[PDB]
Ligand binder design. Sequence first.
Ligand SMILES: O=C(c1cncc2ccccc12)N1CCC2(CC1)OCc1ccc(Cl)cc12
Ligand SMILES: O=C(c1cncc2ccccc12)N1CCC2(CC1)OCc1ccc(Cl)cc12
Lengths: 301, 301
Amino acid sequence: SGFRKMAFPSGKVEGCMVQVTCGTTTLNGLWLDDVVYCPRHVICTSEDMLNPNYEDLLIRKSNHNFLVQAGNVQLRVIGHSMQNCVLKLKVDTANPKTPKYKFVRIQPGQTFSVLACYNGSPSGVYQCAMRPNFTIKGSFLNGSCGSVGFNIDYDCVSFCYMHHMELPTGVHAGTDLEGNFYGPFVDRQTAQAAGTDTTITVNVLAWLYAAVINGDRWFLNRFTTTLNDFNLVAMKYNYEPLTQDHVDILGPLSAQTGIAVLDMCASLKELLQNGMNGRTILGSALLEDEFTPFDVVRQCS
Amino acid sequence: SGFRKMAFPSGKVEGCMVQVTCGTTTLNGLWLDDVVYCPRHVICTSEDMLNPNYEDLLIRKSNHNFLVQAGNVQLRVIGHSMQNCVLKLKVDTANPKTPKYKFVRIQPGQTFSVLACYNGSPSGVYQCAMRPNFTIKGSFLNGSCGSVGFNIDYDCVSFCYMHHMELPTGVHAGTDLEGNFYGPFVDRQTAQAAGTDTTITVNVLAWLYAAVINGDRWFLNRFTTTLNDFNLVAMKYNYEPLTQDHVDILGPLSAQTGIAVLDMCASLKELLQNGMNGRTILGSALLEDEFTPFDVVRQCS
Ligand SMILES: O=C(c1cncc2ccccc12)N1CCC2(CC1)OCc1ccc(Cl)cc12
Ligand SMILES: O=C(c1cncc2ccccc12)N1CCC2(CC1)OCc1ccc(Cl)cc12
């Protein structure tokens, strides 16, 4: 029993983290086989931040201009390349601790574990979600660029996020590991801000199932609803629409609990309209939307 | 910026986890140097659970009765000993991945990271707190006994918890690594239940400081209070008393924010009396008590 914001074990990723310096800028890198991946803005100075031309900034750069440090052992950079917003630094040594890995891009609503790192040193791990507005509500201080987000499937590490910057609301923005930003954000100094966010409905439903699985059933009702009528109320509360594919995905959880998906949609509608009346669900006084249906099955089974 | 329930990286501990079988009971063990630590109830059967005599149950046991599996590599058990509620299994091989470690016992109010494991395999990591009633609100399923809780200090792993059982409220109980239970719980079948819990006041204060550090200041007031008058209100709300040593510990945070500790006690008193009026603090609609003052300084600095 119990329900916690549970991250993946981070050992496999800890062994890939290195420090990357270029100029006076130091950040983190990800060392897999004989390549080190890092944010390309490592090559920038305060001057070139309003209108950087990274193609120009990188052509004026040489290999010896990059210091890579795996702990104390310095790795020799024998090649440099830019892939979108990431820099790829070819090193003389293949990481002996390279796990079986994959570079995957995730969808808004999907979750991942973050290994916050500073100077190539792992500091902490936490679970995060890609918000509908393509930002993440992370925990990051100056020096954390290059920290990675990831999921573990079997023995395979699916890297999905590399950290680049903090937006004005205190939220975070970054790229997949191929260097392509999540959301409409750029690695240059601008007045960029996160757009309006919504609630990840299918996740709130997954979390209500987790609650029931844990014996919290006070919010349950005998009523049911149609997907259409549910969606008509959800949108008034800034919730994303629920699709048939979302109800199909919640099928295992519905079977394990004996509560139909549209039954649980009816309970949600009432919670939205009446609130919780000073009660809590799984230790929370608001509706949690950063657990996917998979996250629940994984922790509750 | 940001504030998350952040665990320690778990790599150092992942490399210590093994599987322990005795009879048809399989659970997890912790392998450090040439010793494997695990819950002693591994040696029990359903029959001997109402009145087990572990001294008798272990004398009738032989070394070959214990199968230890580090992944696929079986480790040969050359010795067995009981230390309070833990079993120590001397093995022929010293764990090459043993980190610098220490066995420490923690206090109610202190936090730690949990590496939930099943069949010796790390499944997930999460932050937990030792409650005032000596229980933890963990996340654990059948098969998780022997999972460990720990803190990392520099490069040293301070092990503080080994998981033994689930209580009826869905909360968890266990031992330090010397086999001594946290709280008045025993490793035998009884109607044992968690006693009444309280809120960890100094932690709620630490978390309010984290909020201010993150730009959430709506709950702040110009009023201040005395430690006595604050404690007189807190106890009405089932909060633990605040001591001078607690205010001294919150000194760094008070200095960094310019909010006196008793100023922040005044804000807390008002939150307790009026509630939050539909507002949130660091993404929460209730007052969070599972972050210590150290946890805040570590994540916010
Ligand atoms: O290291 C940080 C940072 C990262 N995350 C959270 C933070 C919170 C407070 C202060 C710093 C951080 N930088 C350094 C690099 C950064 C973002 C902040 O500056 C200017 C800039 C321009 C373009 C990019 Cl593409 C990244 C940056
Ligand atoms: O494996 C679990 C377990 C651990 N934690 C959470 C759980 C939630 C649901 C079901 C099981 C678990 N056992 C097995 C060993 C256990 C506790 C539950 O049974 C009887 C017993 C007697 C004494 C002890 Cl000292 C431990 C046990």
